[PDB]
Amino acid sequence: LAFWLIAPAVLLMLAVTAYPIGYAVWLSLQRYNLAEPHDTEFIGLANYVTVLTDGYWWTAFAVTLGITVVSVAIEFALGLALALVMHRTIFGKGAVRTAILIPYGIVTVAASYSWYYAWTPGTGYLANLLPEGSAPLTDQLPSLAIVVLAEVWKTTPFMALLLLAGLALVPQDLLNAAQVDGAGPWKRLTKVILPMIKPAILVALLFRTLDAFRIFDNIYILTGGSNDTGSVSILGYDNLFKAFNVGLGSAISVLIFLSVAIIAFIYIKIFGAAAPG
Amino acid sequence: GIVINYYTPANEEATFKAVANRCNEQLGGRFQIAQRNLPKGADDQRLQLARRLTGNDKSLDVMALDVVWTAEFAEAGWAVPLSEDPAGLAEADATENTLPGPLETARWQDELYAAPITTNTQLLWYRADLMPAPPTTWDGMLDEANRLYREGGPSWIAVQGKQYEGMVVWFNTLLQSAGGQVLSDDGQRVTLTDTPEHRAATVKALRIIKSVATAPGADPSITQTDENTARLALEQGKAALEVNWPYVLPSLLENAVKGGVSFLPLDGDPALQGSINDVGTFSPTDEQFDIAFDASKKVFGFAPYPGVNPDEPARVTLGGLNLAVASTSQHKAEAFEAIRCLRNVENQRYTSIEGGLPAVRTSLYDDPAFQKKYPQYEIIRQQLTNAAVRPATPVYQAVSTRMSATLAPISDIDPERTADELTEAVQKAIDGKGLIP
Amino acid sequence: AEIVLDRVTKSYPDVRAAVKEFSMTIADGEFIILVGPSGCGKSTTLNMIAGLEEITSGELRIGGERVNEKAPKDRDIAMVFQSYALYPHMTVRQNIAFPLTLAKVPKAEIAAKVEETAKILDLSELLDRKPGQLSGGQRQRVAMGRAIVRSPKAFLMDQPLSNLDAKLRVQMRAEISRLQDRLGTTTVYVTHDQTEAMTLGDRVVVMLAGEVQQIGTPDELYSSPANLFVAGFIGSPAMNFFPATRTDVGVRLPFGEVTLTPHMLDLLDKQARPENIIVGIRPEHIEDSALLDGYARIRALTFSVRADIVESLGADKYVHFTFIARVSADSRVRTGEQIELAIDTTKLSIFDAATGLNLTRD
Amino acid sequence: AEIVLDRVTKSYPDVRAAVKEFSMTIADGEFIILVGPSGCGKSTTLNMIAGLEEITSGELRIGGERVNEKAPKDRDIAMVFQSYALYPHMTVRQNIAFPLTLAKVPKAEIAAKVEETAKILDLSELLDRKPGQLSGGQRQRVAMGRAIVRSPKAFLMDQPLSNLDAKLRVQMRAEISRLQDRLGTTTVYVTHDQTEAMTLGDRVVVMLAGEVQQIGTPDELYSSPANLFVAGFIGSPAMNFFPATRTDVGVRLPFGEVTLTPHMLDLLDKQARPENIIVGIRPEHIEDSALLDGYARIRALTFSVRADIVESLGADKYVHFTTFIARVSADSRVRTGEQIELAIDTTKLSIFDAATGLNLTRD
Amino acid sequence: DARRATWWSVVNILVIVYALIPVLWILSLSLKPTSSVKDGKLIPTEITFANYKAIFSGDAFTSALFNSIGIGLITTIIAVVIGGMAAYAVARLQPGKQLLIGVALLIAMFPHISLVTPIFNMWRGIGLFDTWPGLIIPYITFALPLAIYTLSAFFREIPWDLEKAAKMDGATPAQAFRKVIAPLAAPGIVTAAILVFIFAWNDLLLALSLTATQRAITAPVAIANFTGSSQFEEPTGSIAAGAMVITIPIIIFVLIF
Ligand SMILES: Nc1ncnc2c1ncn2[C@@H]1O[C@H](COP(=O)(O)OP(=O)(O)OP(=O)(O)O)[C@@H](O)[C@H]1O
Ligand SMILES: Nc1ncnc2c1ncn2[C@@H]1O[C@H](COP(=O)(O)OP(=O)(O)OP(=O)(O)O)[C@@H](O)[C@H]1O
Ligand SMILES: OC[C@H]1O[C@H](O[C@H]2O[C@H](CO)[C@@H](O)[C@H](O)[C@H]2O)[C@H](O)[C@@H](O)[C@@H]1O
Ligand SMILES: [Mg+2]
Ligand SMILES: [Mg+2]
């Protein structure tokens, strides 16, 4: 069976990864400028030894690291809470599940504009709560903070729905036995519920950690590239469409692709649980 | 049929859509101009054009590219040399009635690559009820703002402060008005400090910017102020002094007759009702035009750009739009006819009087009724005799991006340190070093 | 703790009562078996006492107070479910230990009690396997392990030894009965194995259709059942039943007449005499009428029938007629053979054909 | 179909074996009960026969041909699991009728046999309620029912009646034999509750440590146990055992001596007698020696003991003694702390090798 | 039982308002007149609908919805029908090797900036630039990894005894799936299709780099490059109305489910 069954899917996948990613590493080996379409030549590691060395890359990298690890930590922690109350609902039958979808269902650009106006000084409902002269969008660490808060609100149903699906399999007898051996809610949650759901949390938290690393819209609208900050997903876009350096912009693409592939490897290797075992 | 897609800045569309319609009534149905939008802020216009060009977009017909990109789009071959012209008429119509300066920006290595359609030097704007006459110098603006701050009024000096081309137009204006320059006339050499006089100008310019960025009662949002932020602030009445281009008027009289302006309510006046048509065009009878304009002079006014040194007339930087036919386009001869159509004198007139953009054909300066209908005309044409130019090189947008990145956030500027940063960063941009921020 | 139940009731969507107004009293350190048929109210009650289920009406008192609202931690009972559900995410070496870990027992003290428990329940070793490696007769014992660690206010064991070989069962039946006595802790237990129930029970509580039927030490349930169902349900094979009519010294059967002792003739006159009566007897009280001694030859009624089928079980045969007699294996009877049967008049029991109660109950 | 097994073997990581060179045969229409200790390898043998688990080595033959690697569909067995797993969403009817739906049977006939299954099984009302409403023996009934509707070549069953009250057990037990005989299909039953095995089992197989120990009829397993383990493992309570030593007329015991019958002496003259004999007696053969008649006495031995403890299950007194239970008839007047005298017909004795455990009196 | 029910209702209301507040802030900004969009107050007063009609007097947003719902619900199915076959194969048999899981994981990342770079070059020579046959190809390549890794990592964990029972009753595997797996995997698998629709309808970065004309301008990019139609007036009420009309298919769908 199974070697007939993969064929119609892998047929496409293999092509649309192999040509683009292979062609990426070729372009990164060349001097190549969008304004000079065939008038530049092979250059070895020149794009790497420059992009790995400049100050701008390490800030744009370090900020996506901070934003991903902070936003996933919060998105996970609130993800359990939304999952538990959606699973053991009583008075909120139907409605409790229904209201949880729309922060996933909204388009991220619309959400980010709403947060941008929420925080804009003298014209934002929660901006009006700050002491005068604060204007938080204008400063680096505050601009990080508001994009964390925007990203966290937008993402939490990604976690909570997957973790609810991961919890909904758990047989009630295991929870009754815990309850009659007197494990209070937190004791069971930690000694029974999480160990049962292990693989589904490491799947959900992996795909979130990746998504939270490659996220662009939520910083592009809320002060894109503004006073350092930014993100490696912005820095690569800019060095391609507003500087015309295909050699350098592809080298940024390869260097992040490798630097995220090791993260995809770590949650397979170190924590073990994934699709195959 | 046949369609010429005409790309113009979003903020220049209420004028350009209505003239494209005028032109479509003139062409007799052979072909039509269809207006399209590029983004609001200048640097995002170049971004979106360079994509459409590079991706071989067949829909792109004619571009309103910014006055400073002509060297880059000619060097890349994306905009046609005017000597491509199928009828042979383009270089004549580009030359025959324009100004020496507007027509010089369209040349790279002698040959023309574009035809001017608009030009603009910025002006100072002021609340005429809050102060008796506008100061002739930046120190005078700081004095009037500091006075108005103590007095507890709208003390913001509204200026372009975001990290974008805007923020760089201001710095080049101070440096050239203080007699310095960013690059040599060959474009090969960095000139913020080839000599102590250029440094002295540079540090003075930086110190002016730092002082207005840091002053008591300055706008806390200055580090994020677009030109649109600046205009609005003045329209919202939060700023008593503003430094913008020849715009405002369209939004002023419009917002006033919409009742959105606190100091100039015109919505309540029966003679001014119906002035704004169904598509939003300000279109009163000329007696209502004069009522609204006189009511504006009674509270609000405008003046030549402030000096750096007392008794020096300001060397204001050029802005503008240059049309060109795109190299990807099929309908080349029709597009060259369309550029010559959009540049006609009655549509130039229309553009300035119904929109605000200063037309570039010269014969309108010889028209007294135009001289009434566009009050700022005299000081625009005067400032244009004295105008500074952005430093012409194909490299330019790299210089703008690297140079502006040394300055933002504006309040942190040590003039000596940042003059050193500019001398390094501009050299690095000319050399093509590192990632662009 | 004592336990007391008054009018306790459970109902479900259909609403239909799973149990209707059960009531009993259990002293501190008693031992109770809640025996009954598949549908009779049991696991449901056990889950009500454990607090894993809403009491629909009535009152439950434990340890000197009413506890209807208290949560299952609060009640400090321990249980083994019918499903014997283990966690499949911990070796047995902590799956048994688990309650001691919630109780903050010191590491070596826990390990000692755990290996003592592991020897106590004859576990393969302290096997330290994942439960997916075990089967039934190991898994069910491991589940009972985490109950016998705790020493709770009371134990509630739901069919705990249902899945074990007979040589090991009796060993575990010794281990449970020693543990309850050494601890002095109230214990409730459920099984279908009445033979395991009888040897354990200080008191049995036979239940049918969500209703308690009779309560007492087995002696009463075997010798003095209150109705025909209890009389049929306890023992093996089931009680023989025959239609009958009273005589002023005895009773008529389908094959003769038995003189009653005067006590039954008084009680059957003290109660109203029914228009129809059924007589019941144990198959093990029916024997080959050749094998009798003088008092049985005096007291008994003898009749002959054909052994239409026969089976053997060591000390006894079963023989089939029209019914089973569980005759002694000294009988030389073969299949298809006429045999005489007899029983002692004192062992006959008499039942109302209308209300089903036993008139021979003492 | 025929079934045969050829040193079938299974092993797991630690490796250690779980079934070890097992060999057996089942004629078409036979009825075999597997019986043995807890944990000894029962479920795995049945799973490997059913094809739900993989044999390590040896050979399985069904129809007479080899079938080791063939899939569960290829084998045409119906099975009831050791823990009776169930489909949690499906209403009871469908939970039963499911294999008839895999057979694509006309829906009216599926529904009809769904009623016949419920009737023959006493699924009380064909209730069509979620499986979460019938915990306990109601679930186990439904779990069995799927099998008996299919009527395939073979039934393979794993303690199918365990959570049932006695009146249900005996009724179901008859229902199984009726079904098995009416279909004429091979049944391989599995239980470590033994009276169910003895009454069903046209052939009982005893297994220990992953190894077969005796294959035979109920009578052979009761009356010619191959060794002291199987002798003690069959019946309840277990066979009472004593050390013993041979005399030229029979054997010595901890309380006397038996003149052994000439037939058993001829068997004891096969090879030689061991330095110690384990004699063994069924507890239920032991009786009060006051009750015997002359035809038993001539072949009796008697001794007195103090009653260490006493119980009665009605039919029999279970009276404890020590050098044990004597499962005497309730006709004995004994109470604990009294002296009582224990006797039996010595024709009923068993004797075994104290070294290798084999029966010495093997018929 | 008020001690539970009051707390439980308060939390049930809390998550309801927390899921609404930014959507309501969009609606209030949308409905306030140009005099009061600057008022800093959440509760709207003196409501108007001017911003909505000023959008609908333009084909831009409708044509953006018209194409976007198309590409979104084409890709949400036509990728997943191949994703499910390979996910079933990787759950049942061993193509489910560690390397298939690792490759699906890496592509699950394939951060779209790293993919649009090489693509944009390809489409300078190949063309297909503004038509759907450009955009859908990288979209569906983002919609096989999800609809594969999550799809198998969830329904492969269904209980073994029920699968043994299905095998023992003789079901053919691909039909045993629909009869015995799919009816009980569904509450854990409905989410996979929703997460893919919420992606294939709902990204800017592809279309923002790979569309320009009215052709295939999808609803997210048609807001991200948009700014208010009145060039001389405050853009916020029009951007808010834009965001408001953009939400409509999702909130209507969530009210259907
Ligand atoms: N959650 C539930 N929903 C609906 N009905 C239920 C539920 N739980 C039990 N019932 C019904 O109530 C009855 C309760 O069964 P009960 O627990 O008395 O039997 P039991 O103790 O499991 O017997 P055994 O253990 O011998 O099988 C069942 O017959 C069942 O039909
Ligand atoms: N899934 C498994 N993995 C590894 N070893 C196993 C597994 N199942 C059983 N075993 C081994 O086989 C032995 C028990 O086999 P089996 O399951 O046949 O016992 P059983 O007799 O069926 O149990 P029961 O007493 O419930 O009838 C154990 O000693 C155990 O080591
Ligand atoms: O004058 C109106 C024009 O404003 C924008 O252009 C500005 O961009 C730079 C300054 O920020 C200069 O090139 C230019 O002089 C400025 O005017 C806008 O991009 C144009 O479309 C407007 O015509
Ligand atoms: Mg077993
Ligand atoms: Mg039960």
Among the partner residues E165, E169, E183, nearest to D85 by beta-carbon distance: E165
Residue type, A77: A
Cβ separation E161–D72 shorter than 8 A = no
**What φ, ψ does residue C97 adopt, rounded to 5°?**
-70, -20
First to last CA, chain E: 30
| CA–CA separation, B164 and B397 (whole Å) | 10
Rounded to the nearest angstrom, the minimum Cα separation between C5 and chain D is 23
Across the C:D interface, residue pairs with CB atoms under 8 Å apart total: 102
- The region, left, alpha or beta by phi > 0 then psi within -120 to 50, assigned to residue B107 is beta
Q: Three-class SS of residue C278?
A: strand
| CA–CA separation, B111 and B108 (whole Å) | 6
Q: What's the count of helices (H) and strands (E) in chain D, helices before strands?
A: 11, 21
Residue type, B212: V
Angle at which helices E132-142 and A7-28 cross, to 10° = 100
Q: Three-class SS of residue B239?
A: strand
What is the distance of C-alpha D352 from the center of its chain? 22
Instruction: Judge whether C315 and D284 are in contact, CB under 8 Å.
Output: yes
Peptide bond into B116 cis (omega under 30): no
| CA–CA separation, B336 and B323 (whole Å) | 10
- Ligand 4: distance of its center to the CA of D190 in Å? 8
Residue E174 structure tokens: 């691909």
Rounded to the nearest angstrom, the minimum Cα separation between E63 and chain A is 17
Method: cryo-EM
Cβ-proximal residues to B228 (8 Å cutoff; 6+ apart), any chain: B11, B40
| CA–CA separation, B263 and B125 (whole Å) | 15
C135 marked among binding-site residues: yes
Cβ separation A180–C99 shorter than 8 A = no
For residue C131 and ligand 1, the question of a CB distance below 6 A is answered with no
| CA–CA separation, D209 and E181 (whole Å) | 37
Tracing tokens 């349900």 back to the chain, one arrives at C233
Residue type, D229: F
Residue A202 structure tokens: 């490491």
| Other beta carbons less than 10 A from residue C199's beta carbon | 15
Instruction: Judge whether B215 and B412 are in contact, CB under 8 Å.
Output: no
Count Cβ atoms within 10 A of the Cβ of residue A153 and give its class: 0-12 exposed, 13-18 middle, 19 or more buried: buried
E12 interfacial to chain B (CB closer than 8 Å) = no
Taking the C-alpha atoms of E226, E231, E237 and E241 in order, what is their torsion angle to the nearest 10 degrees?
-40
Residue B390 structure tokens: 């952005």
First to last CA, chain B: 44
Instruction: Judge whether D363 and D322 are in contact, CB under 8 Å.
Output: no
Q: Three-class SS of residue C308?
A: coil
Please report the DSSP string for C129-140 in residue order: --GGG--STTHH
| CA–CA separation, D138 and A252 (whole Å) | 65
Sign of the C-alpha dihedral computed for residues B71, B73, B74 and B77 taken in this order: positive
Q: Could you tell me where the beta strands, DSSP code E, fall in B145-210?
A: 156-158
Q: Three-class SS of residue B119?
A: strand
Angle at C98 between CA D41 and CA C3, to 5 degrees: 100
Instruction: Judge whether E43 and E28 are in contact, CB under 8 Å.
Output: yes
Count Cβ atoms within 10 A of the Cβ of residue A6 and give its class: 0-12 exposed, 13-18 middle, 19 or more buried: buried
Cβ-proximal residues to A262 (8 Å cutoff; 6+ apart), any chain: none
With breaks defined as C to next N over 2.5 Å, after which residues does chain E break? 94
- Ligand 2: distance of its center to the CA of D111 in Å? 38
- Ligand 5: distance of its center to the CA of C191 in Å? 9
Residue D133 structure tokens: 């409403």
| CA–CA separation, B170 and B161 (whole Å) | 9
| CA–CA separation, D279 and D253 (whole Å) | 8
Chains that touch C (3 or more CB pairs under 8 A): A, D
What is the distance of C-alpha A139 from the center of its chain? 23
| CA–CA separation, D55 and D148 (whole Å) | 27
Q: Which helix (H) or strand (E) is C257 found in, with range? A: strand C256-259
Q: What residues does each domain of chain E span?
A: 1-257
Query: Which of chain D's residues have a Cβ under 8 Å away from the Cβ of C39?
Result: 124, 138
**Partner residues linked to C211 by β-bridges:** C208
Tracing tokens 């090797």 back to the chain, one arrives at E97
Sheet holding C256-259: strands in order across? C256-259, C250-253, C240-247, C277-281, C349-352
**Partner residues linked to B157 by β-bridges:** B241
For residue D58 and ligand 2, the question of a CB distance below 6 A is answered with no
Instruction: Judge whether C139 and C84 are in contact, CB under 8 Å.
Output: yes
Q: Could you tell me where the beta strands, DSSP code E, fall in B174-224?
A: none
Q: Three-class SS of residue A106?
A: coil
- Ligand 4: distance of its center to the CA of D97 in Å? 26
Residue type, A13: M
- CA–CA distances in Å: residue A241 to residues A50, A246, B288: 19, 9, 48
Q: Which residue's CA is the nearest one to ligand 3's atom 5?
A: B42
The atom number, within ligand 3, closest to the CA of B10 reads 21
DSSP state of A195: H
Q: What is the resolution of this structure in A?
A: 3.8
Q: Three-class SS of residue A8?
A: helix
User: Which of B5, B15, B40, B257 best tests the E interface by mutation, with the highest count of E CBs <10 A?
Assistant: B40
First to last CA, chain A: 21
Beta strands D31-35 and D186-190, pairing class: parallel
Rounded to the nearest angstrom, the minimum Cα separation between D147 and chain E is 9
For residue B43 and ligand 3, the question of a CB distance below 6 A is answered with no
Q: Three-class SS of residue D80?
A: strand
Q: Domains plus CATH for chain A?
A: 1-270 (1.10.3720.10)
Q: Which residue's CA is the nearest one to ligand 2's atom 1?
A: C133
Sign of the C-alpha dihedral computed for residues C199, C203, C206 and C207 taken in this order: negative
Instruction: Judge whether B166 and B42 are in contact, CB under 8 Å.
Output: yes
Q: Three-class SS of residue D33?
A: strand
Interface of C with D in 244-273 (CB under 8 A): none
Q: Which helix (H) or strand (E) is B63 found in, with range? A: strand B60-66
Q: Which residue's CA is the nearest one to ligand 1's atom 12?
A: C18
Q: Could you tell me where the beta strands, DSSP code E, fall in B245-281?
A: none
Instruction: Judge whether B323 and B338 are in contact, CB under 8 Å.
Output: no
Among the partner residues A176, A183, A184, nearest to C52 by beta-carbon distance: A176
| CA–CA separation, C150 and C100 (whole Å) | 7
Count Cβ atoms within 10 A of the Cβ of residue B294 and give its class: 0-12 exposed, 13-18 middle, 19 or more buried: exposed
Please report the DSSP string for C23-35 in residue order: EEEE-TT-EEE--
Cβ separation B409–A225 shorter than 8 A = no
R_g over Cα of chain E: 23
**What φ, ψ does residue A40 adopt, rounded to 5°?**
-140, 160
Rounded to the nearest angstrom, the minimum Cα separation between E135 and chain B is 14
| CA–CA separation, A9 and B300 (whole Å) | 68
Residue type, B30: R
The atom number, within ligand 2, closest to the CA of C136 reads 26
- CA–CA distances in Å: residue E158 to residues B355, C237, E180: 68, 44, 10
**What φ, ψ does residue C280 adopt, rounded to 5°?**
-120, 150
Angle at B154 between CA B153 and CA B159, to 5 degrees: 150
Q: Which residue's CA is the nearest one to ligand 3's atom 14?
A: B319
Instruction: Judge whether B12 and B64 are in contact, CB under 8 Å.
Output: yes
Count Cβ atoms within 10 A of the Cβ of residue D11 and give its class: 0-12 exposed, 13-18 middle, 19 or more buried: middle
Instruction: Judge whether A156 and A73 are in contact, CB under 8 Å.
Output: no
Q: Which helix (H) or strand (E) is E176 found in, with range? A: helix E173-176
Please report the DSSP string for D132-187 in residue order: GG-TTHHHHHHHHHHHHHH--SEEEESSTTTT--HHHHHHHHHHHHHHHHHHT-EE
Q: Do chains A and B touch (3 or more CB pairs under 8 A)?
A: yes
- Ligand 4: distance of its center to the CA of D44 in Å? 8
| CA–CA separation, D314 and D342 (whole Å) | 19
Q: Shortest CA distance to A259 belongs to which of A54, A92, A61?
A: A61
Please report the DSSP string for E184-216 in residue order: HHHHHHHHHHHHHHHHHTS-SHHHHHH--SSTT
| Other beta carbons less than 10 A from residue B132's beta carbon | 8
Cβ-proximal residues to C206 (8 Å cutoff; 6+ apart), any chain: C35, C36, C212, C213, C214, C215, C221, C230, C233, C234
| CA–CA separation, C20 and C7 (whole Å) | 7
Angle at C283 between CA C280 and CA C286, to 5 degrees: 95
B424 interfacial to chain A (CB closer than 8 Å) = no
Rounded to the nearest angstrom, the minimum Cα separation between C102 and chain A is 7
| CA–CA separation, B18 and B323 (whole Å) | 17
Superfamily of domain B3-120+318-385: Periplasmic binding protein-like II (3.40.190.10)
R_g over Cα of chain C: 25
Q: Which helix (H) or strand (E) is E251 found in, with range? A: helix E236-256
Instruction: Judge whether C76 and C3 are in contact, CB under 8 Å.
Output: no
| CA–CA separation, A122 and A250 (whole Å) | 42
Q: Three-class SS of residue B357?
A: coil
Domain that holds residue C96: 3-229
**What φ, ψ does residue C290 adopt, rounded to 5°?**
-70, -25
Tell me the CATH number of domain B123-303, given options 3.40.190.10, 3.60.15.10, 3.30.70.2190, 3.50.50.60. 3.40.190.10
| CA–CA separation, A223 and C210 (whole Å) | 70
Ligand 2 site-directed mutation target among D9, D40, D157, most atoms within 8 Å of CB? D40
| CA–CA separation, D74 and D68 (whole Å) | 11
Instruction: Judge whether C78 and C153 are in contact, CB under 8 Å.
Output: no
Beta strands C203-208 and C31-33, pairing class: parallel
D125 interfacial to chain C (CB closer than 8 Å) = no
Residue A206 structure tokens: 């992996």
Q: Which helix (H) or strand (E) is A161 found in, with range? A: helix A140-168
**What φ, ψ does residue C206 adopt, rounded to 5°?**
-70, 130
Residue E176 structure tokens: 């045993």
For residue C41 and ligand 1, the question of a CB distance below 6 A is answered with yes
**What φ, ψ does residue C10 adopt, rounded to 5°?**
-135, 140
Q: Three-class SS of residue E43?
A: coil
Tracing tokens 């005895």 back to the chain, one arrives at C250
| CA–CA separation, E165 and B200 (whole Å) | 89
Residue type, E252: I
Query: Which of chain B's residues have a Cβ under 8 Å away from the Cβ of E124?
Result: 54-56
